């Protein structure tokens, strides 16, 4: 996997210099398991990596505190990639640009809602069927 | 593991050949700060009489460590970043100066921000004696590791404090430590019933 | 400290002073026999898992 | 007054012989008998009955011949034999009153002052007590309008010595249910609730029906309390009761979902020990 | 005066001043002691103040949710910090409970509403609701029977 | 405890002849009890056997006694009591899970109560939530 | 007149309601309830009465033709959760 690592570092970074150059170092093995198609939609990803962990870790950032961030070229440009990562649902946010500032759904207690109920019964549902399995699986041989 | 070894041997230091004692009690000092909890550490260091009488001795450890306990953060940047100087020429803790100071960092953030609602970049700035870019850089970098439970609000300079109620909480883990054990479940159900 | 149950706001600047309510202690149970469940199924797998 | 009472297995038995006896000998609609019982503060307690002679002319609805010789002869005998019984009202086996009815709770209040009625319906039900008590009230209508001496109806309960106890329990025996909440029963017993509650709600709204066409008069009593019952429906749309029940759901869910992972887990352990035993077992018959 | 004083409502203090000053303080049918003129008795008078105050901090918190202390403050017949004041010194007695929201003067009676009590009160408010409904069936059932007997 | 009898007169029993005549097996089945037998159970008397006459109206009526009200059937326990319950469960399940956690380990380590108990708790603990839940359930959506 | 649902009464109604500006339906509110006639409480931060009962009145046939409406939907309803319990639950009832 230490291809793969220094992939990771690259992306992380968010530097397409250190990307390229390990693409470039690495090609040989990217045939051998083939991604390239993937490594690519990679780079999409990459910004689209910046623009989530920004959208994690503030609740009110500006677009052009956005652009500037990401290295973007403008607040245009910040907007339309954070817009798309709304519609692809990465960031799960809202936006506003009337005063230029993407916005954070209002983070909601999610323990007086349906979502535990959900899980629960999953789980539960689950636990039933595992029992039922067990039981019948349950065998006597004379 | 450190913390409680050094800790349980701090009033009886025998092995001289290793270290002195005041360099054994700088460790001690550095690893409990960053091993163990506020009231821990208050009861076993900041409360310590054998670690007391040394850093007496000692009057930059003794910054450091009460620094951060008396909640006098900028004072506690200047003696972490002495702390680090000193630890990256040691040679035990040579490889692990970054991870401490950073470790040590979200400390000071966590603890700052354990008694806030909505703490202002303004404030945290000021209290650690530091600019508004690099609070406001640190924080984000830290939440992103998910190290901190707070969420920045740049328009108007604002830290939010997003810390789980505790319900919340358990409801969290309950569902984390149910998934580890139903995979485990699972796993040997259809292990065996084939 | 915890000596009073109360969040300080340095927006408004405000002490929202309230009662936390209580540590549920049937979350508390749960987990931990959710746990020694985990180790039970441990043992069944050492049982199991050698024997079959 | 009397807020409360209690008919006994043995009266509802007594009364169901008394009514199958007397249609098997001839036809009637009704059969009357006195019942015999005890106060305990205003809690009567009808434990016993005996049939007295009675017919009527079912044109007439004006002429009856309730036997009050007879009446307390069978009292003074049921003194003789129980001393702690004295008459404390009627009972007649028909589904509906009858014009007679006040009379007849005329005649009895002459042997009780608080002369209760109880119909007790052998054509059995499947919602309610087969025991209607009423109680003979006249009393200027503070409403303003005539009075007229008519029944109120009285809270009627079932309730059993031990003595009838032991012979009600071993007569159930072979159809009886287990006096305990069985996943299976109690969800039964929700439905039944909804049943029960429905056909409450369509006898109030037969009521309605009739008061709003005209065939009955506004009762402004049943109208109090219906106006009462509307007042006291919950609002479930709440948001403070919706987080609540959410809340309480979640927790009653969490205690279900470790349960049944306890169940399941103890189902595992089960089956290792099945398979072991069976590899054992077939080994020791290979070898 | 006793009257008022045993009504379950707010007696404004101005307009009891207004009513029975004359008749109480200054006399005529002879004016008691108590409520005279002198030291005990402007003392007195405050105290009476206070007590007026304290019948209608009760029944605020007997009628009310959450009043503003804009409000109270003119329905109590005291300056905002001098109702604040007064409310805070109930509190700490624990006479009254109240938590005033000083950011937003939001005083609130409203104890806090555990989910249990919540959910409580709507079962006994269903438990009620089934059993008056039983009741009502019982009675309409012997209306039918009765009326329709005619 | 009832029991119904006759005497058996003096004559026959000397001589010889059984008390009552057996020309079926029913009558028998009935183990005639040890106070009878040393009061002379067969020697002066007989036991008949006792059968009930119950009418499908008559067990009706007497069901009746016992017979909940839809009120109880559709009722909801006090949620601060179920709270409680629950809670004292759980924490008995967790005593229960740790002793059957070691009983588990120790018989499989050296090759029950605890497997019962726990399963009788689970029981218990799944059906009166279930209920519960389900109540709550129909009362939100019956009710309004 | 108003239903269970919607219940919280505003102080901008009650002064449509009987001719008061709105600076004593408060005290019109605490004489209510102090009589008896409603009860509840008075939100007066938010300018809303909360009232959770009413002193029954005789009513005319109008009045009990809502209520005979109301009643219509209150046992549709019932009947469906009926009908969906036990379709449901019927491979369990007893």
Not at chain 4, 1 to 9: F, G, L, R, S, T
């Amino acid at each position: 996997l230490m291809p793969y690592f220094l992939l990771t570092q690259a992306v992380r970074t968010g530097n397409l210099a250190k990307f390229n150059q390990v693409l470039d170092q690495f090609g040989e093995k990217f045939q051998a398991d083939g991604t390239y198609t993937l490594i690519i939609r990679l780079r999409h990803n990459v910004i689209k990596t910046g623009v989530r962990m920004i959208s994690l870790s503030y609740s009110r950032i500006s677009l052009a505190d956005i652009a500037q961030k990401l290295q973007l070229d403008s607040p245009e440009d910040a907007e339309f990639i954070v817009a798309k990562a709304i519609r692809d649902g990465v960031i799960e946010a809202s936006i506003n640009h009337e005063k230029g500032y993407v916005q954070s759904k209002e983070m909601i207690d999610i323990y007086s809602t349906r979502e535990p109920q959900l899980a629960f019964h999953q789980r539960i549902s689950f636990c039933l069927d595992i029992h039922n399995m067990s039981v019948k699986a349950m065998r006597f041989p004379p | 593991q450190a913390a409680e070894l050094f800790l349980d041997t701090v009033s009886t230091f025998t092995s001289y050949e290793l270290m002195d004692y005041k360099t054994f009690v700088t460790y001690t000092v550095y690893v409990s700060m960053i091993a163990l909890e506020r009231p821990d550490l208050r009861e076993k260091v900041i409360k310590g009489a054998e670690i007391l009488e040394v850093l007496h001795s000692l009057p930059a450890v003794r910054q450091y460590l009460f620094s951060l306990y008396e909640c006098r953060y900028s004072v506690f940047f200047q003696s972490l970043a002495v702390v680090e100087q000193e630890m990256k020429k040691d040679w035990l803790f040579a490889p692990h100066y970054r991870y401490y100071v950073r470790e040590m960092r979200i400390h000071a953030y966590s603890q700052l921000l354990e008694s806030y609602r909505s703490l202002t970049l303004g404030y945290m700035a000021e209290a650690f004696g530091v600019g508004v870019e690099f609070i406001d850089q640190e924080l984000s970098r830290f939440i992103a590791a998910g190290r901190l439970h707070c969420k920045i609000d740049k328009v108007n300079e604002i830290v939010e404090t997003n810390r789980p109620d505790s319900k919340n909480w358990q409801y969290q883990e309950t569902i984390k430590k149910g998934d580890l054990l139903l995979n485990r479940v699972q796993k040997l159900s259809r292990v065996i019933n084939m | 400290d915890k000596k009073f149950h109360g969040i300080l706001d340095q927006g408004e600047g405000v002490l929202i002073i309230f009662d936390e309510p209580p540590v549920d202690k049937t979350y508390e149970a749960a987990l931990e026999t959710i746990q020694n469940m985990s180790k039970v199924v441990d043992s069944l797998y050492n049982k199991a898992k050698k024997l079959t | 007054a009397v807020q409360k009472v209690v008919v006994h297995p043995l009266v509802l038995l007594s009364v169901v012989d008394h009514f199958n006896r007397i249609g098997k000998v001839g036809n009637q609609k009704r059969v009357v008998g006195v019942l015999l019982g005890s106060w305990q503060k205003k809690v009567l307690d009808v434990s016993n009955s005996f049939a007295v002679p009675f017919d009527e002319d079912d044109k007439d609805d004006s002429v009856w011949f309730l036997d009050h010789d007879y009446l307390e002869n069978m009292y003074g005998m049921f003194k003789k034999v129980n001393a702690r019984e004295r008459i404390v009202g009627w009972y007649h086996t028909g589904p509906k009153l009858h014009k007679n009815d006040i009379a007849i709770n005329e005649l009895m209040k002459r042997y009780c002052p608080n002369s209760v009625l109880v119909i007790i319906d052998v054509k059995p039900k499947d919602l309610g007590l087969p025991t209607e008590a009423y109680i003979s009230v006249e009393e200027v209508h503070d409403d303003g309008t005539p009075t007229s001496k008519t029944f109120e109806h009285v809270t009627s309960e079932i309730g059993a010595e031990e003595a009838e106890e032991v012979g009600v329990e071993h007569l159930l025996r072979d159809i009886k249910d287990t006096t305990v909440g069985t996943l299976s029963q109690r969800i039964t017993n929700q439905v039944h609730g909804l049943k029960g509650l429905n056909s409450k709600l369509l006898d109030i709204r037969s009521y309605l029906e009739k008061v709003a066409t005209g065939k009955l008069p506004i009762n402004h009593q049943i109208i109090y309390q219906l106006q009462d019952v509307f007042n006291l429906l919950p609002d479930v749309s709440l948001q403070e009761f919706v987080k609540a029940f959410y809340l309480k759901t979640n927790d009653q869910m969490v205690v279900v979902y470790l349960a049944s992972l306890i169940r399941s887990v103890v189902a595992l352990h089960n089956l290792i020990n099945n398979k072991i035993a069976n590899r054992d077992a077939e080994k020791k018959e290979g070898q | 005066l006793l009257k008022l004083f045993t009504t379950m409502e707010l007696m404004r203090w101005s307009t009891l001043v207004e009513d029975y000053g004359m008749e109480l303080r200054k006399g005529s049918s002879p004016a008691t002691d108590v409520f005279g003129s002198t030291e005990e008795g402007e003392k007195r008078w405050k105290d009476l103040k206070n007590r007026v105050v304290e019948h209608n901090i009760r029944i605020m918190a007997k009628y009310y949710t959450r009043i503003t202390m804009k409000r109270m403050a003119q329905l109590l017949d005291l300056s905002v910090d001098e109702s604040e004041a007064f409310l805070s010194n109930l509190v700490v007695n624990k006479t009254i409970f109240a938590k005033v929201d000083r950011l937003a003067g939001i005083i609130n009676f409203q104890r806090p509403k555990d989910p249990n009590n919540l959910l409580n009160d709507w079962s006994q408010k269903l438990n009620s609701l089934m059993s008056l409904v039983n009741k009502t069936t019982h009675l309409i059932a012997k209306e039918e029977m009765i009326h329709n007997l005619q | 405890v009832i029991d119904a009898f006759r005497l058996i007169n003096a004559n026959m029993m000397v001589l010889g002849h059984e008390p009552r005549q057996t020309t079926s097996n029913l009558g028998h089945l009935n183990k005639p009890s040890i106070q009878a037998l040393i009061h002379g159970l067969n020697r002066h008397y007989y036991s008949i056997t006792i059968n009930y006459r119950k009418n499908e109206l008559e067990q009706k009526m007497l069901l009746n006694l016992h017979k909940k009200s839809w009120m109880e059937g559709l009722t909801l326990q006090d949620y601060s009591e179920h709270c409680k319950h629950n809670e004292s469960v759980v924490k008995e399940m967790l005593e229960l899970a740790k002793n059957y956690n070691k009983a588990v380990e120790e018989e499989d380590k050296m090759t029950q109560d605890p497997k019962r108990h726990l399963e009788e708790h689970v029981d218990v603990l799944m059906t009166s939530n279930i209920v519960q839940c389900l109540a709550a359930m129909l009362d939100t959506v019956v009710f309004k | 007149t108003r239903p269970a649902n919607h219940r919280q009464l505003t102080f901008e109604e009650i002064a449509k309601s009987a001719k008061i500006t709105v600076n004593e339906v408060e005290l019109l509110v605490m004489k209510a309830l102090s009589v008896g006639l409603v009860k509840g409480s008075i939100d007066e931060v938010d300018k809303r009465v909360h009232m959770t009962w009413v002193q029954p009145r005789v009513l005319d046939l109008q009045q009990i033709k809502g209520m005979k409406d109301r009643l219509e939907f209150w046992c549709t309803d019932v009947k469906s959760m009926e009908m969906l319990v036990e379709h449901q639950a019927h491979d369990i009832l007893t």
